[PDB]
């Protein structure tokens, strides 16, 4: 039996070493009630440009989109470097697992990744987003197959997906086949759609869905946590930003996979078969002696 | 713009020529208010044996399971035969598209299937169930890949799926790849969770989820109809049995795939690929000249 | 020695059977002066939505974006169908090689493509676009490697590329490696910089750059034709819409590759090597017997 | 914000310690207006034999080509040695970056290289030319892959290419992938071709193209400098030899890679992949204890 928290805080949107201390103080506030896994929202460090249209017609490209883009570009991080060392030392001071939605750069491109840290201040891995939704396709980049992680820990198998990658039916059945029983899902929408969409994943899987959204002032977000039977443990907090906690019986999975079981004794292998191409594809490839 | 009605009837459970007239005295009331498509519940003709355990221990097989089986086997139909001619001549008189949940026999087996009829009183095809759930595995049989239909009609394309075949992600993504926009889904469970399960399919797809359940006396069924924007038109009727109607604006689909749109442009063929083995596999095959 | 004409027409933008007769009443005027190859602008059939922003903030998705999308979706064609038969019967009567910029649909997606026709009124093939630019990423779709053609004809070899697929150096060097000597290039921007951009391709290759832009009323388009010595034959017509012609001496290529000549003898295979993955990748694949 | 100059001076063509002082005086003339990066033309020290045919038929090889060759060979330098020490001490006297087009020897062979120096009189590296063009194949040597440098400085990343190595599409996309934002390009031709050829590199990249040609008395060369948006800062000076200066806003790159970005979010890695063989290949290799 473990116990986990989600947060609901917002970011200061510019000056990224100013929002890097909010994480410190909230992480210490979540330390005190004996938490063991802490989840942070989507684009917590880099910031999420809400409302901004960058003045895009259909090929106008005015001068008041370029300055906006460079002011936004100048406020991201890069992994590894001096901003992941600080987070490792942050999670190393005591025993806590930390997942975190940042925005990284890699030579004038922006990615929307999520980082995974253990209880001894190592850096496990990252997961760049497969496909941005609508108007984020102008500003963010596409991820490939060689990123989707597994990450077995001594408290379970944790993995993640971001906003509307939780609608793709073929990425979920690749997450399921690797053995996920704790399914993190940060997001950036606050609808009635979302609460009724996470319940379906919690049933179709057998995992604890544990989501986190941000509250700012404008997307009054509601984060939650759902049992693998479909019962909400900690409700949709639509009022203010607060720490939300609950406890996770890991023996509630073996009993929830008595009726239904995807990848195992459902999903008739004699008719259906999915296969995943997981190759590190890159444009330019130097080889030396 | 079309309009379609689901029913929330119940069956007489025994003496199957008696329950075929309910399917007219409800039907003309359903079609007198200018209807165009009628959807019936799961196992409406044969009867869904509720509560019955058949005295199965672990392989004890007592005498009060055998008579209970044979009395149930004696109340099935067979296709094509004298009970589908009645349904064709039924749908031929007036004009409706009729879908129907039956139970068929084929030499001492039972297959939970669903039938499709057009407005000119012809027989389009059937869809047997892929996998029965828990204890229905003892009494029903398995389906193969060479059964999943779409049946393009002049009011749109119309597929189906039965109770917990709607949780299988591969079967849904194989339904979507042929172009379903009217997603009929009979069922036989009535919980709070099924509504949340159907909203997600309506959002993930772009189709009109149009479900149907039975209400008897313990089947507090709630059948509904969901827009492809995740809006319930005619709500979950938990009180009594009725006729449930709405209008189906088929121009509200092209506008819903401006955002999401699975396979193309939102599936990634470079990483994921699914394939389906649709072969008519049967045990003994006779060949002559 | 052949001769080819580009056009500088404009579309009626809505009601696409109306804009298909412009493609005859300009076409016979283009073919009456003894022409042999006709090139049309980018998105001449479906229409290029200029100025339109669809009210996309960051994921607000208001109600006046959906209707604007569906009215645009409703004005596309599909291949092969009743709108390409008209073009084949058009090109078949007299003798011309017809290339054409269209917009096609394939189950609620839009692909900005280009079509090739021979003189006997057959359909050679099509070339979808690899990557839409900035805000066209929301409304158009991506292309795979299994589309890039060359189509050896008895007047030479003829490929194509669309607006900013001419900046990608790898796609150009993959076009060159099959033996392009007539380089057709429709576009949808008209700046001072585009002429300087096309001169470099004409010198780097050895082909005839033969571009086409539309002029409407804001598309001050200027289309031209450039020798493989970097000499403009028929100039940048920025004033009004017209027909633009020249003669294409195909013996002025062998003489121009005396100096430069990419891949062999001027590429260095010992240091550089490029490779292309030309596989027809699609999401769901059905197999039967 | 840095500022850079190009020069347009010619050489004295023989007696290489007489042209080594012209560099000194011009470098001191460029010091006074607070310049910070100075670029010199192709073959500034060794001299470029213009007009000379060396009496080559097709294997005649007369005696009046041999004396010409030895008189030309006797006027090169060799790196390192007493002629690079002088340039290091020349650039060490104050704060300037010096790039320089010389001709080196290596045991009776001639190369066309380019030397890079820092602000503290170190010797960073060199770049021998990959393939000489037409009749320079008889007199110069081929370079290999283990020469093309990166050279990050505190004012940016400077790299170079020589005359017609700026036409190879595969060498540019190896320069781009390493991060070049200041692109030096000395040359030895004066056409209308060249000005329209550098604009394309400035757009296709995102870098400041900063070229330099020589004016002698006969190739009245025109040197220039182009913004990453395609706007000429300091024009094509076709009249006389002069110092040409401008200022280089390095925040104009981040804003120019908002629209288009090669190696990053263009150049689809799922279809194209270039790879470079970078090995120090030599014919005879002694090894000892």
Numbering used by the authors:
A (entry chain J), B (entry chain I), C (entry chain K), D (entry chain L): 35 to 251, 276 to 347
What does the paper say about this structure?
AtNIT4 is a left-handed helical tube with 4.9 sunbunits (dimers) in one helical turn, a pitch of 8.62 nm, an outer diameter of ~13 nm, and a ~2 nm hollow core. There are two diad axes, which are related to one another by a −5° (negative value: left-handed by convention) rotation and 4.31 nm translation along the helical axis. The extended C-terminal tail of each monomer forms two ß-strands, which assemble, along with strands from monomers across the A- and C-interfaces, into a row of 4-stranded ß-sheets in the interior of the tubular filament. Interactions across the helical groove (D- or F-interfaces) were not observed and this could explain the plasticity of NIT helical twist. AtNIT4 shows high-structural homology with other members of the NIT superfamily including a conserved αßßα core and CEEK catalytic tetrad. The substrate-binding pocket is a ~7 × 4 Å tunnel lying close to the C-interface that runs almost perpendicular to the helical axis. The NIT superfamily binding pocket has been described, but in addition to these shared elements, in AtNIT4 a loop from the adjacent monomer extends over the C-interface in line with C197. Crucially, we observed via molecular dynamics, that this loop is held in position by a charge–charge interaction between R95 and D317. On this basis we refer to the loop as a lid, R95 as a lock, and the flexible ends of the loop as a hinge, which open or close, shifting the lid relative to C197. We propose: R95T eliminates the positive charge at position 95, which disrupts the interaction with D317 and allows the lid loop to open and shift away from C197.
